[PDB]
Amino acid sequence: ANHLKFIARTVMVQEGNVEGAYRTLNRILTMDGLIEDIKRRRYYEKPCRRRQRESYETCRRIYNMEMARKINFLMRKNRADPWQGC
Amino acid sequence: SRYGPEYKDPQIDKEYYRKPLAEQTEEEKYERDFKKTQLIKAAPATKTSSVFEDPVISKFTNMMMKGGNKVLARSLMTQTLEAVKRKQFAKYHAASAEEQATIERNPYTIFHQALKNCEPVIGLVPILKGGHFYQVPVPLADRRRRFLAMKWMIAECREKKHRRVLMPEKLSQELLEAFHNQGPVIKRKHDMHKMAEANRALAHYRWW
Amino acid sequence: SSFSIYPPIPGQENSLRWAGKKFEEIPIAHIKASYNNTQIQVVSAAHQPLAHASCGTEGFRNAKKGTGIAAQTAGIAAAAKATGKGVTHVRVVVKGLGPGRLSAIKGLTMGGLEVISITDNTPIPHXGCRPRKARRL
Amino acid sequence: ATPSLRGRLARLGNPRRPILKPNKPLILANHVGERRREKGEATCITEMSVMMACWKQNEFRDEACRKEIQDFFDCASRAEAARKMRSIQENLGELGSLPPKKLNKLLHRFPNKPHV
Amino acid sequence: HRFMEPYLFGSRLGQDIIDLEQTAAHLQLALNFTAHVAYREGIILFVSRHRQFAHLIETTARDCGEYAHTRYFKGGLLTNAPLLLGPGVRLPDLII
Amino acid sequence: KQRAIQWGEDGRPFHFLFYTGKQSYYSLMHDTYGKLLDVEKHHNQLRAKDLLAEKTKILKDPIGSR
Amino acid sequence: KNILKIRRRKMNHHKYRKLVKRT
RNA sequence: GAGUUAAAUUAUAACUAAGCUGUAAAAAGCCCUAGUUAAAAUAAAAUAACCCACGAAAGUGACUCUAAUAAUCCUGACACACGAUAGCUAGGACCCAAACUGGGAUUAGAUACCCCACUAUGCCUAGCCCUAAACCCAAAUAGUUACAUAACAAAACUAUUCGCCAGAGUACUACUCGCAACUGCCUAAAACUCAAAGGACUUGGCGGUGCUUCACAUCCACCUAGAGGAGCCUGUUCUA
Numbered sequence: 001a002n003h004l005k006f007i008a009r010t011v012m013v014q015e016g017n018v019e020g021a022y023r024t025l026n027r028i029l030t031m032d033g034l035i036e037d038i039k040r041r042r043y044y045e046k047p048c049r050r051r052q053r054e055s056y057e058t059c060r061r062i063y064n065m066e067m068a069r070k071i072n073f074l075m076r077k078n079r080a081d082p083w084q085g086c
Numbered sequence: 087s088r089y090g091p092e093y094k095d096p097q098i099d100k101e102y103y104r105k106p107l108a109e110q111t112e113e114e115k116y117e118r119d120f121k122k123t124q125l126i127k128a129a130p131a132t133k134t135s136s137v138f139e140d141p142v143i144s145k146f147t148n149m150m151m152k153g154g155n156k157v158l159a160r161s162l163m164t165q166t167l168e169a170v171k172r173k174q175f176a177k178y179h180a181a182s183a184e185e186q187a188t189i190e191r192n193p194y195t196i197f198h199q200a201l202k203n204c205e206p207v208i209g210l211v212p213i214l215k216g217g218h219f220y221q222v223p224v225p226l227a228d229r230r231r232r233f234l235a236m237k238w239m240i241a242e243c244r245e246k247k248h249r250r251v252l253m254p255e256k257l258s259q260e261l262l263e264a265f266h267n268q269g270p271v272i273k274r275k276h277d278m279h280k281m282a283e284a285n286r287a288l289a290h291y292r293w294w
Numbered sequence: 295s296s297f298s299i300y301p302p303i304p305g306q307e308n309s310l311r312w313a314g315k316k317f318e319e320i321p322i323a324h325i326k327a328s329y330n331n332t333q334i335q336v337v338s339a340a341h342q343p344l345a346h347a348s349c350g351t352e353g354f355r356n357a358k359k360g361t362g363i364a365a366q367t368a369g370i371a372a373a374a375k376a377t378g379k380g381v382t383h384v385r386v387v388v389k390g391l392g393p394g395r396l397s398a399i400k401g402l403t404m405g406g407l408e409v410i411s412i413t414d415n416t417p418i419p420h421x422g423c424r425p426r427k428a429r430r431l
Numbered sequence: 432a433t434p435s436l437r438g439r440l441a442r443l444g445n446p447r448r449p450i451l452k453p454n455k456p457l458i459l460a461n462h463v464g465e466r467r468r469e470k471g472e473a474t475c476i477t478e479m480s481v482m483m484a485c486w487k488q489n490e491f492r493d494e495a496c497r498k499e500i501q502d503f504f505d506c507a508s509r510a511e512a513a514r515k516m517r518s519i520q521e522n523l524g525e526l527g528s529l530p531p532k533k534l535n536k537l538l539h540r541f542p543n544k545p546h547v
Numbered sequence: 548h549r550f551m552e553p554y555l556f557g558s559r560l561g562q563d564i565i566d567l568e569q570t571a572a573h574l575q576l577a578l579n580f581t582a583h584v585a586y587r588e589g590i591i592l593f594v595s596r597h598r599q600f601a602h603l604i605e606t607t608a609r610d611c612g613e614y615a616h617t618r619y620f621k622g623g624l625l626t627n628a629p630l631l632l633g634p635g636v637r638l639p640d641l642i643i
Numbered sequence: 644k645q646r647a648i649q650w651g652e653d654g655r656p657f658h659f660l661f662y663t664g665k666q667s668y669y670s671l672m673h674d675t676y677g678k679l680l681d682v683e684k685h686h687n688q689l690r691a692k693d694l695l696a697e698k699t700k701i702l703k704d705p706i707g708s709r
Numbered sequence: 710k711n712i713l714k715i716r717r718r719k720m721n722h723h724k725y726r727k728l729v730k731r732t
Numbered sequence: 733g734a735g736u737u738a739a740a741u742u743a744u745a746a747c748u749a750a751g752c753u754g755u756a757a758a759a760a761g762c763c764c765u766a767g768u769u770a771a772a773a774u775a776a777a778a779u780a781a782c783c784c785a786c787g788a789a790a791g792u793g794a795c796u797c798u799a800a801u802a803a804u805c806c807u808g809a810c811a812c813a814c815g816a817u818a819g820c821u822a823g824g825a826c827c828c829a830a831a832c833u834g835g836g837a838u839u840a841g842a843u844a845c846c847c848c849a850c851u852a853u854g855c856c857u858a859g860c861c862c863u864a865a866a867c868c869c870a871a872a873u874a875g876u877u878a879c880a881u882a883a884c885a886a887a888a889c890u891a892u893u894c895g896c897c898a899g900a901g902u903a904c905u906a907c908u909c910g911c912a913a914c915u916g917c918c919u920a921a922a923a924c925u926c927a928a929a930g931g932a933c934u935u936g937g938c939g940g941u942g943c944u945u946c947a948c949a950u951c952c953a954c955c956u957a958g959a960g961g962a963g964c965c966u967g968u969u970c971u972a
């Protein structure tokens with residue numbers, strides 16, 4: 001209300017298309033977490049639920065980022081077996 | 087089904103075999119048809135290589151058949167084309183110079199064009215959500231639209247016709263009525279469009 | 295062709311004029327895409343309203359007006375009324391998150407109106423009024 | 432980088448109060464979850480709406496809506512072709528990441544060892 | 548492994564180094580014990596589930612005249628020998 | 644067809660793969676793999692000597708080989 | 710599970726809070 | 733303690749529009765309304781936070797300043813001090829959320845879930861009440877990785893010391909002592925009834941539990957011919 005307008009959360013179209021510009025805006029909000037934040041602010045969650053939600057988000061983030069490393073670590077072991085029928 | 091999975095649908099068009107040298111890819115298609123030694127089903131009784139048949143006529147003839155009287159269905163279809171031809175010939179004679187070369191005297195041309203105007207463009211299918219059914223419009227496939235047009239023609243001429251008027255003559259009238267975009271079947275097609283357009287906001291329910 | 299996503303700052307002087315006028319002179323199209331209705335209003339550079347349109351005013355009623363098609367029709371009607379007053383380019387501001395955000399954006403494009411900049415001004419409290427309780431549906 | 436798992440879980444030799452209370456133990460399995468099928472959405476909506484405009488503007492007669500009618504048919508065929516081909520190719524296309532069947536075999540070759 | 552600590556001379560930049568002095572003492576008894584059981588007409592089986600030397604080990608036993616098993620090991624082979632192999636089977640007297 | 648006796652009077656198995664459960668199948672696999680190495684070794688020697696006197700005879704389509 | 714004991718104590722306390730209110 | 737306000741919202745004003753809110757779908761409510769621009773007070777503290785710090789616990793994470801976090805570093809009550817939230821007494825504040833209550837809808841009924849309005853109250857100052865799944869269900873101080881897997885879970889154990897525990901139901905109850913409590917808190921039995929109550933696990937069944945896949949007379953979408961309507965034939969029930 002006090003800041004200047006048409007600076008924050010604003011994109012400009014190029015070559016006359018609007019679908020592409022809108023998707024760029026959505027990626028900006030999704031990366032910054034505003035899209036999920038608006039979803040959670042439609043209703044009110046008690047502080048008991050908020051901590052229970054962050055204890056599940058953090059656990060998923062640890063497991064997903066640890067399984068991902070093992071996948072990349074073992075990714076090179078997918079070539080054709082040189083000792084088939086050995 | 088006495089035919090196994092290896093059997094395929096035979097090709098009936100004679101012209102497909104008489105001029106194969108003008109194309110190369112199509113030559114590879116049928117040269118491998120027997121080179122793979124794939125079995126071929128027996129020729130159907132209804133379909134024949136006669137140049138005077140038409141696939142749309144056979145399907146329409148089959149639908150009119152009740153029980154197993156193919157001869158009676160063929161007889162009714164023969165008279166209906168004759169009945170249309172007589173009416174068109176009579177109207178041609180009583181016409182002016184500019185009106186003479188407007189009237190079509192080909193029953194096959196009329197029959198093909200009549201069905202292409204009675205086919206609905208967008209249909210309806212009930213969808214259950216929230217314990218209630220909502221009529222959700224869908225882009226019906228071409229085969230369904232072609233089938234639905236034939237069924238409407240048969241249903242109309244069987245129900246609301248008088249007892250005295252014969253079947254071949256009553257169906258002949260509707261073919262001319264549909265050829266001019268004024269038959270009751272065209273009205274029924276528009277009625278289905280009326281309901282589909284009214285429920286245009288419910289198209290989001292469908293998931294395909 | 296160097297194109298910058300960021301808007302031209304009014305303090306600087308950018309030689310990028312649409313229809314002979316600067317960036318700030320171009321009218322504004324406010325879009326409020328709620329969860330049950332979509333309201334579209336176009337205002338001039340001096341914040342003077344030109345035309346107003348919404349799903350309710352276009353004949354849609356009750357749950358129907360909350361669908362995307364209802365917002366799409368409103369954008370076409372709003373652009374048609376706006377184009378009558380002689381506006382070519384407009385800066386669209388999107389308010390809130392709802393099912394009608396995409397439809398209203400392309401509704402103006404197909405209505406004879408051209409957009410050049412997109413702004414999202416969803417009300418985001420920073421700690422604010424306590425919202426309603428949850429729904430145990 | 433992986434979030435630190437130091438002084439998080441509730442253990443006897445932990446002075447800090449618990450920060451994480453997992454539903455199930457954080458032990459790596461020998462298999463990954465299957466891919467989730469993408470939920471469908473209504474297709475040919477931007478083309479149906481313009482078709483309805485011509486019908487309402489011409490007493491529901493396709494005498495002048497031929498351009499809109501054909502596009503609606505074209506969209507239906509285009510949507511039909513894409514719908515009846517996504518399932519077969521997506522299994523082996525893999526988007527650069529091996530299908531779940533191949534990853535399960537790869538993990539079995541290098542299993543995790545909770546015991547001993 | 549915890550039980551390999553006494554047999555490790557040390558660790559070099561995170562890589563363990565096996566003390567060959569203890570290896571020589573153990574290998575001396577291993578070869579001595581292997582020869583004696585072969586002297587007394589004993590059955591020796593070579594077992595190695597590794598898919599890089601399976602052919603080399605399998606050929607090694609053929610030259611020595613002994614038996615080798617570098618393939619998949621069935622569950623009830625050595626324990627439930629009568630059912631797996633035959634009615635009367637003489638079990639191997641040494642496994643390598 | 645009946646299996647022959649697999650051991651002598653002293654109990655020593657005749658074949659060197661009797662303790663693998665399937666001596667006949669694995670012996671065939673061992674010989675088949677050994678032939679591949681010999682072909683690879685022979686081909687390696689031929690490549691060293693710069694001679695290619697062999698041809699691919701796998702294609703037996705007119706005979707109808709399966 | 711232990712819920713079979715909390716529910717038993719739940720009913721007794723609930724019935725006790727109605728005996729006090731009635732009398 | 734003292735001072736301060738970014739983002740949102742509302743009183744309020746201008747302009748345009750006739751509708752606005754709401755749901756799986758509606759009704760009710762509003763039309764003193766809605767959108768945009770301008771804008772106090774009260775209340776609550778996006779991202780940082782994938783960080784794990786401070787306090788004895790309950791707790792604390794918008795900014796600034798002041799004061800400030802016991803013990804030369806064991807255990808210890810019924811004694812002293814403290815103790816979320818709800819609730820009480822008096823004064824002040826009230827955007828917004830909201831038990832109770834009223835209306836709408838659903839249902840056989842709905843004094844429930846869903847929708848709309850509004851009160852206590854959530855807030856500030858002073859006093860009281862002293863209860864929680866106050867649970868990390870794991871007491872404090874020193875240690876060991878030796879011995880050794882009931883089960884499950886968060887591996888096993890030694891030394892000093894305090895508190896607590898003697899079948900289940902009756903029972904966070906009756907009686908009694910203290911309390912700013914008076915529908916209260918703390919302390920806490922018996923008569924009588926039963927031969928069990930209870931912890932963990934295994935297989936099976938089931939699930940209006942989730943994920944993936946599938947119904948070629950098949951559940952839906954969809955095709956054809958029929959039953960239920962009438963007479964007649966025949967078979968049951970009832971009547972006889």
Ligand SMILES: [K+]
Nearest residue numbers: 420421777794
């Ligand atoms: K804040």
Ligand SMILES: [K+]
Nearest residue numbers: 934935936937
């Ligand atoms: K089971």
Ligand SMILES: [K+]
Nearest residue numbers: 958959960961
């Ligand atoms: K009957």
Ligand SMILES: [Mg+2]
Nearest residue numbers: 001002738739
């Ligand atoms: Mg402000």
Ligand SMILES: [Mg+2]
Nearest residue numbers: 446447448787
């Ligand atoms: Mg601490």
Ligand SMILES: [Mg+2]
Nearest residue numbers: 452453454455
């Ligand atoms: Mg648990």
Ligand SMILES: [Mg+2]
Nearest residue numbers: 717718720721
């Ligand atoms: Mg009881």
Ligand SMILES: [Mg+2]
Nearest residue numbers: 742743773774
């Ligand atoms: Mg006020």
Ligand SMILES: [Mg+2]
Nearest residue numbers: 759760761762
């Ligand atoms: Mg009303």
Ligand SMILES: [Mg+2]
Nearest residue numbers: 742765766767
């Ligand atoms: Mg207002």
Ligand SMILES: [Mg+2]
Nearest residue numbers: 051449450784
């Ligand atoms: Mg914390």
Ligand SMILES: [Mg+2]
Nearest residue numbers: 787788789802
């Ligand atoms: Mg302390």
Ligand SMILES: [Mg+2]
Nearest residue numbers: 787801802803
């Ligand atoms: Mg201290």
Ligand SMILES: [Mg+2]
Nearest residue numbers: 806807808872
């Ligand atoms: Mg002390």
Ligand SMILES: [Mg+2]
Nearest residue numbers: 815816861862
């Ligand atoms: Mg208190």
Ligand SMILES: [Mg+2]
Nearest residue numbers: 817818819854
């Ligand atoms: Mg309180």
